[PDB]
Amino acid sequence: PKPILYYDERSPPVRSCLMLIKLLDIDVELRFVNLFKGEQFQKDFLALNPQHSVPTLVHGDLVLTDSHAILIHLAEKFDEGGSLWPQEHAERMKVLNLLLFECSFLFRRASDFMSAIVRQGFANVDVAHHERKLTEAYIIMERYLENSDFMAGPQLTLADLSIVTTLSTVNLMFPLSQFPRLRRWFTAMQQLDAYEANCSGLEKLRQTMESVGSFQFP
Amino acid sequence: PKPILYYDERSPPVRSCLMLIKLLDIDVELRFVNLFKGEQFQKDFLALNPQHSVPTLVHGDLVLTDSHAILIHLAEKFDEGGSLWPQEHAERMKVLNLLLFECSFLFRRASDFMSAIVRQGFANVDVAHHERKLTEAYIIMERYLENSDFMAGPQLTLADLSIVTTLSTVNLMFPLSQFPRLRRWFTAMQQLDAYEANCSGLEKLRQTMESVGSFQFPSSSAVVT
């Protein structure tokens, strides 16, 4: 059976998988789960994924509930011998390391910020606090780009697909003008054919956040 | 060359790597970084790992800055063909899925809770809020263990090593009375010879948190075997 992707394109990790699917021409069945209507708490989805999160991939009997596992799985199954998920161990571990940075550092802080807006309202969020936390992530990625054109080396990898969607989401609020390597990389990422898979969900998140948060991004 | 592990044993992710090293009898050079004294912000360590986090592994030219990558790299180099990081693709993806659960959900919430204690003092923390968010992680792990004997399947894997350390950390505060599968699984993990590598740093984290947070964990919560 072809893979089934439960998704809401406002989620940046969803968009990372949509970019990989477009990049590799994967035939996938999309199933929309509206996160802002709480559809991730519907009994059948909770039974499928008790973490009530998207993306969720069902591929045969395999149920994956984290975008980084989905990216790796789809690359191994549909891009064997490719460069997005390098076959050499040291290069593959460097891509793994940056995928985990995205999960544990960049996305955690992006989620902390966006969730604060939803819960407290934009007017009541400590914006300076989150600006510092996310600017630190900008600084780290700027250092990661010192020796290489991409996040994990000289070529595009799953690490770039995972990072770019969250960064574009944080970039809604905090510009990249003070980070030259990072701004050039982000501009280069926007030139990919596959980057088109990010545009629609980013704009939907922009307008959903502005309405729910009762504000407007700069 | 031999792997270098920058560590603070109070970190649950550090203890996860310490358990794998003991389970596999890997010779590693331990280099201590005191998280509570702020040695992770020293110039030399920041240059090596700008995320200023432990565990950090240096193995030859490879520098890993996340425990889950470290567990996978060590399993592939010292448990080739083993069952901790299984060779069959579907089983391996299941282990990876649970490692990312630990990173994105259990550890995220456990760190939110401990961080608040350190920053505000226990008496100013909204403990009920964190009790809810961590009980939800308990429920999810209980669900995983209803369908399988270990976290990712019928055998011990890297997912159990990653999860048990943060679980033991959360369980300093929140009891497991209502979670029989989690209790049975935790009890089994504590019988493992490798679990000795978790014991010491758990206790030191208990002592440090009580001091910095100006409180005491309820002694009745922690599961002891």
Numbering used by the authors:
A (entry chain BA): 4 to 221
B (entry chain AA): 4 to 228
Manuscript excerpt for this entry:
Here, we report the first crystal structure of an ecdysteroidogenic regulator encoded by the Halloween gene, noppera-bo (nobo). nobo encodes a member of the epsilon class of cytosolic GSH S-transferases (GST, EC 2.5.1.18; hereafter GSTEs). DmNobo forms a polypeptide homodimer with a canonical GST fold, which has a well-conserved GSH-binding site (G-site) and a hydrophobic substrate-binding pocket (H-site) adjacent to the G-site. In general, GSTs catalyze various reactions with an activated glutathione (GSH) molecule in the following three ways: GSH conjugation to a substrate, reduction of a substrate using GSH, and isomerization.
DmNobo D113A lacks the sidechain carboxyl group at position 113 and therefore cannot form a hydrogen bond with EST. The crystal structure of the DmNobo D113A did not show significant structural differences compared with the WT DmNobo (DmNobo WT) protein. In the absence of EST, both DmNobo WT and DmNobo D113A showed GSH conjugation activity although the activity of DmNobo D113A decreased by approximately half of DmNobo WT. In the presence of EST, as expected from the EST-binding to the H-site, the enzymatic activity of DmNobo WT was inhibited with an IC50 value of ∼2.3 μm. In contrast, it was barely possible to determine the Kd value between DmNobo D113A and EST because of a weak interaction, which was consistent with crystal structure analysis.
